[PDB]
Design a protein around this ligand. Structure first.
Ligand SMILES: NC(=O)c1ccc[n+]([C@@H]2O[C@H](COP(=O)([O-])OP(=O)(O)OC[C@H]3O[C@@H](n4cnc5c(N)ncnc54)[C@H](O)[C@@H]3O)[C@@H](O)[C@H]2O)c1
Ligand SMILES: NC(=O)c1ccc[n+]([C@@H]2O[C@H](COP(=O)([O-])OP(=O)(O)OC[C@H]3O[C@@H](n4cnc5c(N)ncnc54)[C@H](O)[C@@H]3O)[C@@H](O)[C@H]2O)c1
Ligand SMILES: Oc1ccc2cc(Oc3ccc(Cl)cc3O)ccc2c1
Ligand SMILES: Oc1ccc2cc(Oc3ccc(Cl)cc3O)ccc2c1
Lengths: 229, 60, 60, 229
């Protein structure tokens, strides 16, 4: 039984949803990793049937969502959670949303999985060109958009079967310049592409696991709008 | 009218393949890479952008 | 002992994936690129070499 | 009803065969394009059941070869056949083996196809390093291994349906130096990869046809054994 964990879905307008939809075409169980800030809005809509159409897979098939879990790619373990977010109106009532906690969580409920999708990015200062991005904003972009992949691998490699596959999404702005893609997003994608190679080495040799990254074209996703430039 | 609208419009006018890129287009490729059908591919950056990346100078 | 035997030997010891490369590995990838599943891919060079191409310096 | 013409098959030990095997796995009709010099020897081995086992598709299926035609990628049309080859014992009892003729031959017997595979290469001087490769040898390599792809497209595009797809095989030698891969193969592969991009633009804009190339790893095929180094 193929089980894919898709990290980075807050709506049906993104690539994560398009990936999920296509995977269910092949009958693979889908586990959603939702960012806490939009978790309630997502569940609320899902339950109120606001995605029913979006879940129609041509051949009548109804997209099968195995589970939906709060997930924050910026926290590796439970003692990495600062008090502020700990007590935030959106996080306060949730638990087991760190990278390490969702790995154990998925492992205890469904066992080993064999498919991992990294479909998230985040840059606070995306509106600023590279030259005027701060060290804090830049490191924030690399921490959420790049490191998150490495950390996902470190923790999920123990719950993944041999010959499993991992993928993430990148953008050509890492290789060629596109003005407007700031905040260090271009930097983060460059690192991500580079890390995909180094990880393909460590994961391939040690675990027989593969990892590739898809450089996608433009899609009018919710996040795409944040790029005010 | 925002960056994304420029990106999309530019992609649909100059890409070798003129057609709307759907989230499912990336989905179908992501599906192939995640399956054992691609057991010999790893550490790669696969482009799914209707070929835009191969262009240098736009037509008109 | 011939060029091809050196390459195959080298590929199986230093590629990220230490497995035998079969003509059907390339076959399944060809099959996918030839189908509508890859409607958004064109003008690309896809590597199906167990990832050997990403290495610079060999371990041993 | 998908129909795929595979140009560049002389046995079951190459990639062309691995490609055919995987295609028929998905019920696509296969047409082989066989180089004249080994056509009769191939048909003979085929008729005596020497490929019988090699044709068993994992799922207990039998590989269905629609047709097998003599085909020489170095001749674009009938009036390109020189008297030397025109009289050769191997090409005598054969006709209609030029890129244009087989295109017409296929169109006449089976109609339009939607998949084309270029899986052939040829370099008379592969044993000499680039520096000592002659002009005649260098050009022969490009003509047979590179241009052949362009001519295939030009003539076959007339018998292909919209949204068809085309692939060819290449080797990383075009990007990084591999001692032993001489006689202009590296140059030809470098032209093939670049032409693929350019052809993608034309075929994409004018016919909505896709073209890509696969950079394969090492395979102990018959031609591979040839490269003495
Ligand atoms: N839309 C495009 O035009 C485009 C193009 C090329 C590459 N990409 C890539 O596709 C991926 C997904 O983006 P999308 O464009 O489909 O938009 P999207 O808005 O659906 O994806 C971003 C998601 O990441 C989540 N997120 C942010 N910070 C997080 C965190 N700390 N923990 C967990 N989740 C977090 C958000 O909830 C959001 O749903 C990104 O990696 C992006 O770089 C997108
Ligand atoms: N074997 C490898 O390690 C390797 C690696 C990467 C790429 N490739 C490529 O794979 C492709 C197929 O090679 P293969 O290695 O499977 O070997 P192969 O020996 O099966 O294929 C070569 C074929 O080309 C045909 N040929 C030569 N000149 C021709 C002409 N004028 N007209 C028609 N056919 C002609 C021959 O009959 C022969 O069957 C080649 O393009 C090769 O460069 C191979
Ligand atoms: O805080 C942010 C800021 C920007 C973002 C861009 C994203 O995806 C992309 C959208 C469009 C394009 Cl062209 C490339 C992307 O990576 C995804 C998440 C983001 C989060
Ligand atoms: O006359 C010749 C000379 C060399 C050849 C190499 C080929 O395929 C390859 C085999 C091994 C490797 Cl490593 C790369 C290839 O392209 C294919 C045909 C050839 C014909």
């Amino acid at each position: 039984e193929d089980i894919c964990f898709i990290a980075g879905i807050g709506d049906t307008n993104g690539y994560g949803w398009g990936i999920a939809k296509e995977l269910s075409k092949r009958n693979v169980k889908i586990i959603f990793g939702i960012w806490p800030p939009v978790y309630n809005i997502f569940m609320k809509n899902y339950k109120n049937g606001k995605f029913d159409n979006d879940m129609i897979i041509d051949k009548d098939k109804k997209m099968n969502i195995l589970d939906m879990l709060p997930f924050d790619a910026s926290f590796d373990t439970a003692n990495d959670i600062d008090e502020e977010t700990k007590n935030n109106k959106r996080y306060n009532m949730l638990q087991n949303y760190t990278i390490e906690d969702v790995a154990n969580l998925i492992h205890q409920k469904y066992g080993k999985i064999n498919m991992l999708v990294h479909s998230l990015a985040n840059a606070k200062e995306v509106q600023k060109d590279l030259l005027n991005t701060s060290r804090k904003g830049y490191l924030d972009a690399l921490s959420k958009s790049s490191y998150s992949l490495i950390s996902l691998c470190k923790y999920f490699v123990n719950i993944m079967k041999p010959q499993s596959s991992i993928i993430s999404l990148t953008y050509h702005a890492s290789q060629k310049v596109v003005p407007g893609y700031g905040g260090g997003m271009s930097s983060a994608k460059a690192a991500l592409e580079s890390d995909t190679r180094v990880l393909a080495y460590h994961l391939g040799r040690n675990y027989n696991i593969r990892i590739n990254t898809i450089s996608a074209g433009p899609l009018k996703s919710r996040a795409a709008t944040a790029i005010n430039k | 009218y925002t960056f994304i609208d420029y990106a999309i419009e530019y992609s649909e006018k100059y890409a070798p393949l003129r057609q709307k890129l759907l989230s499912t287009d990336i989905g179908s490729v992501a599906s192939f890479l995640l399956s054992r059908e691609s057991r010999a591919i790893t550490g790669q950056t696969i482009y799914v952008d209707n070929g835009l990346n191969i262009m240098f100078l736009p037509d008109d």
